[PDB]
Amino acid sequence: VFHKIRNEDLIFNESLGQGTFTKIFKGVRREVGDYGQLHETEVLLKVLDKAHRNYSESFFEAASMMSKLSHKHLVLNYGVCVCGDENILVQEFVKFGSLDTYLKKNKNCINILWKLEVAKQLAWAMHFLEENTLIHGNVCAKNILLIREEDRKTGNPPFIKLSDPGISITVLPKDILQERIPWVPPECIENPKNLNLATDKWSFGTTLWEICSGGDKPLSALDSQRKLQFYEDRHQLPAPKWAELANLINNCMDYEPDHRPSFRAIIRDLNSL
């Protein structure tokens, strides 16, 4: 169950770009808050076309399932507005945006402990999802949102949240799945119905590679045909520039899904670094 938000209470201010068959906007929600105060809340609006009915159902099913969980590292959805010709997810606006963009804009001037802190937080979110037997299916650095920057005076680390899952790879066109190599694991390129909790362990490895590579995209030089051949020849990503997490990345990106470590074990490994 998603809280319903009246169309009249949503103002669209900025058109920010596109996700996978979504249009993204910054806006404001006029709402009655705690103690009955009228608030104008910055919101991020994910807009789906109603005509793409199967995409929409997958998208909002995923959003709702995960929003039934409350967790400090999972993005907050405020509700939905389906009172248009479009279905709108109304989400918290995370001030510092996507982690890959953030790393690029800061020219990768962040230390290894910052990266490990973010990795630990993402792993904590993924362990929570794993304990709930809930597959995310779209773990990547762009879906890691930075709530706050490190504060060296207070000793407070960066703090992240993981985005909603979006449309499932079980319904997306094959060409999209291939473009998402190497986040989409090899068994899912073989058959998108092989989606499993193990999927997210593989994608977590790819995401760690991104975090350690300053927001570079792995295999960016390879077109889809060559990405498919990269999996065919069972190749691994190059060791990232910060190589401290190279071993963990390879252990997560195991071509045998059953051999990928649990998030409890991933957290232990991160703790020991």
Ligand X SMILES: C=CC(=O)N[C@H]1CC[C@H](c2ccc(F)c(C(=O)n3nc(Nc4ccc(S(N)(=O)=O)cc4)nc3N)c2F)CC1
Burial per residue of 180-189, b for 16 or more beta-carbon CB atoms within 10 angstroms, e otherwise: bbbbbbbbbb
In the complex, the smallest distance separating the C-beta of residue 209 from ligand X, rounded to whole angstroms, is 18
Distance CA 92, CA 120 (A): 22
In the complex, the smallest distance separating the C-beta of residue 15 from ligand X, rounded to whole angstroms, is 8
- Residues binding ligand X: number (CB under 6 A): 16
Instruction: With residue 174 as reference, give the H or E element that holds it.
Output: helix 174-179
Contacting ligand X (CB under 6 A), which of 91, 168, 203, 207? 91
In the complex, the smallest distance separating the C-beta of residue 97 from ligand X, rounded to whole angstroms, is 3
Distance CA 191, CA 269 (A): 30
Query: Which residues in 147-176 contact ligand X (CB under 6 A)?
Result: 163
- N-terminal to C-terminal alpha carbon distance within the chain: 41
Nearer to ligand X, 19 or 185 (CB): 19
Distance CA 273, CA 264 (A): 15
Q: Is 211 in the site for ligand X (CB under 6 A)?
A: no
Q: Are 146 and 99 in contact (CB under 8 A)?
A: yes
Q: Is 24 in the site for ligand X (CB under 6 A)?
A: yes
Q: Is 97 in the site for ligand X (CB under 6 A)?
A: yes
Q: Is 94 in the site for ligand X (CB under 6 A)?
A: yes
Residue with structure tokens 């998108």? Answer: 192
Contacting ligand X (CB under 6 A), which of 93, 114, 159, 255? 93
Query: Which residues in 235-264 contact ligand X (CB under 6 A)?
Result: none
Distance CA 134, CA 66 (A): 8
Contacting ligand X (CB under 6 A), which of 145, 169, 253, 270? 145
Distance CA 135, CA 195 (A): 8
Q: Is 27 in the site for ligand X (CB under 6 A)?
A: no
> Interface with ligand X by CB under 6 A: which residues?
16-17, 19, 24, 44, 75, 91-94, 97-98, 142-143, 145, 163
